[PDB]
Amino acid sequence: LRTVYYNMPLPKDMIDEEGNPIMQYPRNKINVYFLVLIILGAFQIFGVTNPGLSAVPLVVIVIITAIKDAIEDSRRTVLDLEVNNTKTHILEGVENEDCKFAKNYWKGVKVGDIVRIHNNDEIPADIILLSTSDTDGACYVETKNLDGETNLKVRQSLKCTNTIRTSKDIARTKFWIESEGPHSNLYTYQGNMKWRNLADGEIRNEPITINNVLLRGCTLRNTKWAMGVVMFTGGDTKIMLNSGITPTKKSRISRELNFSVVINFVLLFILCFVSGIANGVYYDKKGRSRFSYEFGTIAGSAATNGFVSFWVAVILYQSLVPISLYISVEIIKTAQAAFIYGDVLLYNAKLDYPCTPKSWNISDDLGQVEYIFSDKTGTLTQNVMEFKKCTINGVSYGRAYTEALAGLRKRQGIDVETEGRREKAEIAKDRDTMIDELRALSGNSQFYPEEVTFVSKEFVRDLKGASGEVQQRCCEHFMLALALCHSVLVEANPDNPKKLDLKAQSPDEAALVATARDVGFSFVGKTKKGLIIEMQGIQKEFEILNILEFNSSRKRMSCIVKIPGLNPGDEPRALLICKGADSIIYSRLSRQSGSNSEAILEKTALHLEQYATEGLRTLCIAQRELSWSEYEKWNEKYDIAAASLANREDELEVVADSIERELILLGGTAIEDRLQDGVPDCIELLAEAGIKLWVLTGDKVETAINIGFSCNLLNNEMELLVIKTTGDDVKEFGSEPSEIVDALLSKYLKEYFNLTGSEEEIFEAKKDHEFPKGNYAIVIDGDALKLALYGEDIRRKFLLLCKNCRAVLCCRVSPSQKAAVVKLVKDSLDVMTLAIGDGSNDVAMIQSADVGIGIAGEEGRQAVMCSDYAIGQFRYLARLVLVHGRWSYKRLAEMIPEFFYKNMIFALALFWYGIYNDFDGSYLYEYTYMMFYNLAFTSLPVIFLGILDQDVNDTISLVVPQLYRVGILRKEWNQRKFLWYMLDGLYQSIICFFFPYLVYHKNMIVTSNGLGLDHRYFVGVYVTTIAVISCNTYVLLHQYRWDWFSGLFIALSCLVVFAWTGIWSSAIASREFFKAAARIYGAPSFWAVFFVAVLFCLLPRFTYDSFQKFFYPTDVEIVREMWQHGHFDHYPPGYDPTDPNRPKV
Amino acid sequence: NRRPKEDAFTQQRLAAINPVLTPRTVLPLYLLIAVVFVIVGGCILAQNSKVDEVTIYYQDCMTNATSSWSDIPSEHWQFVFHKYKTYNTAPQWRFVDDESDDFTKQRGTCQIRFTTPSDMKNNVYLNYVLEKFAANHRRYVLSFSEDQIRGEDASYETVHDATGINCKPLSKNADGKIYYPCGLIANSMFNDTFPLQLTNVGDTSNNYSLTNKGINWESDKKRYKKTKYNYTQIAPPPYWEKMYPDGYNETNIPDIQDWEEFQNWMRPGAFDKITKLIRINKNDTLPAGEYQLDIGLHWPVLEFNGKKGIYLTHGSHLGGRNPFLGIVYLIGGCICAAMALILLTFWLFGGRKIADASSLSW
């Protein structure tokens, strides 16, 4: 039960069943702050530490899990900061009787709290409108928070209740509204909104339809104000329960980051244990200075085996380093993903749209991709259709020369020869049509070979027919049924009232009716009961009553029509027209007619496979006359399915399946489908970089092969597997040689592929990230994909054959099989996948991958919301992956080992001083060199290496794509590289300590004037300064791209240790650290142990890099060698090969 | 328009130099650091070999000395003179007496007579060295009162329970009197009486005067101030109870703004060897001759086997005679010349051409 209330004070302190917060109602809050306060409270700012060793896992197990997942999920907190704190003046805290707006709190809005809308306000709750601020309720929305659709859809309220808009009728309602609960849907919501009038007190109705649907994600644009109550506020709705199932996609470096943090704490816990036991060994010696001049007891075990409450505070101070890590990588990942947004070369200027990241923290998953799962149309195809060829009554008529060049490879001398007299052919005859609404500018889709040869094949030879030219009556029945069966509507553009345009969801139906109104048969109107089509100008209305819908797991759509009374005294029978894929129409045909399996049906399939190797997307047209007696035997079967609750799942499909059982073939149809610009340059640029690209299409095998050549996916490699039969597995036990259809999948994958490659069943040497040497390619019929993913030990034969091949063309693949093959490669291998594609039928492929790219601008902006990046066309993927992904992988694979390095060069000399004060617990550093080291001293150059380091230029990343193959092989982030930076940080911590120690190891004066500076806090200026400079100039030597912006902020981080010492240790409040600027920096022994300890820190590693990039260089050193010698100087800046207008060079 | 801003920063086109470490760049970089640190290391050890010093330990003067002039055994004294590298005329002590009315653990003047065959040039510093005394423990270095260092009338509940640095074991005695220098640092000073003149025995009886002013930084007189207590609410710390045997009178309140031996002691040294300046003479030259300083023993170390000492030197610009800082420039110049010959013998017998050796083509 869902309720709403008014004329009730709605208390928060009511115990009885009269208010909201008892029944588990949603609250808008969609701990942490106390924990970070007491960590700073324990480390000696104010307060005391926690007693004993009662938190050595209890700090660690919360700090790698609870305040990792809170910092790494800061993307949605800023998205929550889109919900709250956009605040304006509202109508929340208003009594029942206060006629004036009051400034209040947005997340305090109540179920039934009426708020007047304004300009630029996100609608905070499920409001229900009754009156608009515009005439006729014309409300056109702008919905950046609901869906990717940044364009128009109609919001229309009922006409009679738009007049009531004054605010002097507030107290008229006293009841709750009848609605359905949240049931996890996005677009569909049919409710029932009844309320009551003012003047007398009578109730009236206002049924909400799809036009007046309102949601929390809605944002009502281009209206001024409206007055209506709200229903749902909080976290229980329909726009938020479709999501929330997702685990928000932590990246791969951000999931192996916890092995690095734990083995840091294990090194800390060894040091705070060896110290704590050698502290108690000191106290059990009974011959020390501690007895007389200190007032210590004659005992050991100071707290628990010596002073360990010191080393608790050392453990708890080093816990501020992982919190400093996740804040650092979430201002690098956020900044790397704001540079993807701000790139002008990822900008789609045709439809005004930059590359928008929907997930600001997976930018390094783009740099390790060896599987891209593509859809075919809409993404590798600009998805505007053009009707070319058709077959009627078996015989084909209709030609074209559009992209036969991808099939006519060698036998090509036909540059202009066919297209010359082709243009002469259509211009000489196609003026002689005789029908209304012939628009010859757009009418050149099917240029007339022959339909009637403009003489109509008159009826004077046979009034009764059946003696010749029955194709003339068959072709008119074809293009009628091609125009009649659709889902396209009629509108009128304001440019010309006579000329009418047609828009549809599926661009086939836009293209099928376009030629259908070129040769008679003008589809001009859509009646609420009928349908208006002028057959050769003669108007006659057809009433449709069942439109069988189309989703991509069905692969056909059907429609019914009632033939009006043409014979005297009889209501004639009905007719169904079904169009769809030929792989499902030939399976559903008649076996009792005269037009059965003979040459008249065999050459239709011969022509359509000839149309698909031509490159066109095929489709079949099929009908059956339904008898009027058996017509109303299945209409009432929709009363238990379509009129009931089950009108959206498989009970409606199986009751639609019973009518489509056998049909008769009417004809076929083929459609030109052009490619997007730069797709043959984008696939060719990704397949150089070692990425194994798949194409998960949904249409016929011979189409996607010919598209696969003209997009440069195939060179000469193909190896095909097909079911070549019509049976399935109905078995349960046995019968493996007797039954065929999975036996010839087992014998084809095993026994015919010991030839090229020699493999078997399971062995754990199965993870080899190399790009395969011998080029081969699987093309698979999809019905042979259901049989190769049905059981275990046959899905490992499909996966081990597709591991070893450069391209996979999965054809006739349902959208449930698209997502099943993505998560098969994803989990059973240790690989990282991308899934680019548009369309509402392509969202489970995107969500089941690691990165999901969504093509916008096309028919589907449903795949843009479930995506992570949202590029405009396809050709921006090679700029996204090879430039902004390959950079963003090597940036995060260098600042992570240089964050645990810079810890140990400083915070490990608190241990090396431990062996001289006998592990007792005097801090070497003065109280603010511990606060400001990892925060202000050395914290910025690892941020500007994560953000602004680039190994080569953005031109050279595309000219040499094979520099991406380092991240595919996982050679920049392994756990061996991490341990060498901790050994380099442990070497330079004995340099930064024992070089200031040996100036004081005879412990004389180290000053020019003899006055002496030998306090703990003055050795920790020798130690701190040569640690700050030697891990800020270690950053400068290990980055490429010495620009001016990073080198200036390394210089200002190298001189901020000299500047905070000059300010804090001249201030009077710094006790016993008082003129340490003018005492230490003015000492000539500071500036002589400075230049030789900064050397010895940088000396083993700059020599090793010199030995590494002379004799065993990387591929990114050798590219940087050639770039100084002018091999890349003729390429212009701002370069991309995936562009049709910029020249070659 | 929703087109992003092309300003050569969001396009990541900042001006850069892009360093490539080819062996025509870093091989002159290695022979440049080598010919700096070898030459600077020769100019430090030429300076740091001319520094002379005198170290005499005297912790075993009450027990292992006679009442006549006997030579110090060689385990205590060591002194280095650069003009006279072979010099073995040992200094001689003379314990004066157990003066018969004292605390009988260290008492009586320890007279020490040494010989200097050089000229300690202008600033002749006299330190004192202290070995195996732990002034860097945890509770020790955190026990004083900064408001009493700065000279305020802090209450009992201001020196006792302040956060961080409070004088926790030592804040009152029995009678409500706050110890005015409170904490383990001020309670446990060094209180031998060094002389204010090196007695020029033998030569001429023209003394060498040593002053105890300017012994610390002259910028320490801003956080060290004289106090304003009332001479009836304070009492000396319990190891100062042989210097103020009756208590504090109207006059004997220690001016710690001016008493600069105390200001040296209230910075606890960081390691287990302590050298603090206690005598100086910025005026004259210390000529060659046989001198005598006479230390009145008051501060005991032999109950923990510590050491007490004398450190008479003219300093340097890098401090005192510590030969580390000039050796390590020679090591940092020989390694940068070793690791330039390792990477030039390997490069000739070895080496690459500098284009198109990629694994991409392989």
Ligand SMILES: *[C@@H]1O[C@H](CO)[C@@H](O[C@@H]2O[C@H](CO)[C@@H](O[C@@H]3O[C@H](CO)[C@@H](O)[C@H](O)[C@@H]3O)[C@H](O)[C@H]2NC(C)=O)[C@H](O)[C@H]1NC(C)=O
């Ligand atoms: C200054 O020099 C004097 C010697 O002239 C050093 O002697 C310290 O004087 C205190 C006075 O209370 C003595 O402590 C004594 O302890 C034992 C056993 O508890 C007992 O004989 C007495 O009852 C008295 O409490 C002791 O002579 C000595 N303290 C020690 C050795 O710890 C004093 O250390 C020097 N002070 C400074 C600040 O340098």
Ligand SMILES: Nc1ncnc2c1ncn2[C@@H]1O[C@H](COP(=O)(O)OP(=O)(O)CP(=O)(O)O)[C@@H](O)[C@H]1O
């Ligand atoms: N509006 C429509 N009416 C009838 N048939 C259609 C149709 N749209 C597509 N079809 C046919 O249904 C078949 C399967 O539909 P599906 O939607 O899976 O193809 P598709 O267009 O999505 C290819 P892709 O997977 O690359 O997007 C296609 O071969 C197509 O010919």
Ligand SMILES: *[C@@H]1O[C@H](CO)[C@@H](O[C@@H]2O[C@H](CO)[C@@H](O)[C@H](O)[C@H]2NC(C)=O)[C@H](O)[C@H]1NC(C)=O
């Ligand atoms: C207060 O105490 C100080 C020392 O604690 C006194 O100084 C000494 O006084 C004695 C006389 O009792 C004399 O020997 C000297 O004047 C001082 N001794 C030394 C060794 O110098 C001071 O006189 C006391 N003042 C009062 C008013 O009692």
Ligand SMILES: *[C@@H]1O[C@H](CO[C@@H]2O[C@H](CO)[C@@H](O)[C@H](O)[C@H]2NC(C)=O)[C@@H](O)[C@H](O)[C@H]1NC(C)=O
């Ligand atoms: C300079 O030193 C001489 C040292 O001469 C001793 O003087 C004392 C009396 O002062 C006498 O008893 C000794 O016998 C002398 N000789 C020796 C070898 O000890 C002193 O006069 C003063 O310390 C200083 N003189 C002046 C004027 O400052």
Ligand SMILES: [Mg+2]
């Ligand atoms: Mg699509």
